[PDB]
Amino acid sequence: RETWGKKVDFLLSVIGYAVDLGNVWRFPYICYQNGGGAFLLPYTIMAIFGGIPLFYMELALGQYHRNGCISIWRKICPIFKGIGFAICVIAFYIASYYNTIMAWALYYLISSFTDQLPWTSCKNSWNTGNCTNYFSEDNVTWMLHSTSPAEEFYTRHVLQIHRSKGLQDLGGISWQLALCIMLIFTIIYFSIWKGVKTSGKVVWVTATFPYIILSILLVRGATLPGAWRGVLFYLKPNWQKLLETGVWVDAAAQIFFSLGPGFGVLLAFASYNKFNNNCYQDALVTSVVNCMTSFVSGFVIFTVLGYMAEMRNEDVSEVAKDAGPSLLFITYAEAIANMPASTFFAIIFFLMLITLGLDSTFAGLEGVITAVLDEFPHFWSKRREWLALGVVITCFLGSLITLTFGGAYVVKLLEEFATGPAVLTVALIEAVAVFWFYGITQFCSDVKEMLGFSPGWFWRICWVAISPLFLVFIICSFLMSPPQLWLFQYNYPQWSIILGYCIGTSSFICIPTYITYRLIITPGTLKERIVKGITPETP
């Protein structure tokens, strides 16, 4: 057994895991759409009530048994051992489109290495038609079908989405994106080549650059004309919108996604921690750091949006007609194109996005490797490198389909599914199993032995009263509202929803399949069949 080494290593690694590429655009969009400037209070309430306890429970579970994401269940509740496979498939599905977005960002960074940014003007070949969506319009002009030059650069040069008619006409593979994703994959492989030592060494570098980059971006945005309007927009309470449970559900989903319990990463990271490590302080520090990082990201995003709106002489939120991964590569692309310092700030922002994605990718791959390996302890000789190569190859094969010209469609389909109810249901299953079958009193005694003091009654009542209730409420709300995907001038067909539902179900279906397998594999009567799978196996 190997430990994390330095305590700061685990803290930095889990902090880098907490910060995500999707935490810079989804959070501002969900705060603007629901709640507004008053969205912080329901967000904080939902956080305190249901996200920090889940993080603490996952950290304690990882630190106690020092096992992966499949053997922990076998140690606590063998009847629910399919959670590891569900976590693995969820991580693979996420990592496909995640590496696709990494390739897109790397291509943007490579193309942003010239003195003149290619998306400033629409005189290039990829930009063809509408060019009336510009900055500082001296003369009045308005067309109902205008397209920004940055949008043309993103959708016709990087993505080349104009060559595909949607999910049906999915043909052609971009070689530049292929090379970028190959370099990203080999960088990831070299980062987690040996084990957690190299992972911590690279986290020490790629987890501090994003923070100074964000500080530079904030100080640049503050000294801009019109940043005050964006500041008021981000800080304009709307208490009338807080009277329905939709905003609370959205805030709970956002905080659960940001903290990320049940992803199979916290358990693996805490498995490498010392037995006498205080997980309470670590969990609290990580939670507050992630919350402040999300708040700063929302601040800078809204400041940039307000500056853009002031430059376009119009109210804010009118320059954000599309929400998602394209929001960055459109709005920020235009902002840096109009910025006095274009190349430097564009490169800095692209490097920030690259690091943000890379940290999460290392965390997920390390968690998957730990989960797969800990099931087979007899492979500690020279199997780590082979397993890393295998998981890298699997991720590459999964992202190959997303690497196509029309890969943005499948990337968005995965991101809306690959990340959603499939992970929340897994987290709910984990929590319900731990707090009903393993026993809340047993877990409290275990964590007291770990630290030295019994946990307070607040967590004891929370884990059994409000966390599963909030999780099941989130699941019910999400399952009762079918999604309506909308990419650039394209409406997802009916069969796309069915495909998304089936791929989302294929992850959650692991738990019932393992339940049936354990029921049909454990000899005994009908009543003793469940009993065997509930009591933990003797060491």
Epitope: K123, S125, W126, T128, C131, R156, Q160, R163
Partner: antibody, heavy 118, light 110 residues
Amino acid sequence: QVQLQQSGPELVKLGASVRISCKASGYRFSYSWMNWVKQRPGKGLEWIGRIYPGDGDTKYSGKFKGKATLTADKSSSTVYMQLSSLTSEDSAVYFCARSAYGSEGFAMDYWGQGTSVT
Amino acid sequence: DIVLTQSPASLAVSLGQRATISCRASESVDNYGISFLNWFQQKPGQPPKLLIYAASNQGSGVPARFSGSGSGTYFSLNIHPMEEDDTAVYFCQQTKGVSWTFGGGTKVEI
């Protein structure tokens, strides 16, 4: 409708210079490349360069980097063209054209009238 | 500077006979699904007129008889049927993002 107007023919002595303009109207002047071609008497066409009125970026194909200069004036919605060190070898007719959109492969659909330069 | 060669240099095609003109470049002109090659046609003492853009789509004021097709390196332009007013020189030109070059042209007689 898109109409391109060109000046009449001129006479150039040995080592003199000429100035050729091209008035563009009826469309977005600042969002369409302006390119000029050279047609020798009895011979084929010859591209001479292009210029973007909205950005002022000029591109040269052959050895006309120091021989031909392209300037644009958005105030009057016209594109100018200047040639230096003109001899009898280039005693041809120079045309003016506007490039189309990118999705049409920078089509050279609209032409001018051509000026007979001696 | 992509070099474009047009063959044959002179075509002798009468009424009722298909007139196929093909010019081959040196490098591929397809980058985003559009072939950066256009075909022109000029009469003696007349400005040239665009016939087809992107080597696959007909122009605005161009008769449907000036059909063209091709992708990659080889492009073809066929006129069927053709009249006595088609005895004009046809030029094919590339529109790459670095430099543009013109061909040689075919002298169509009758």
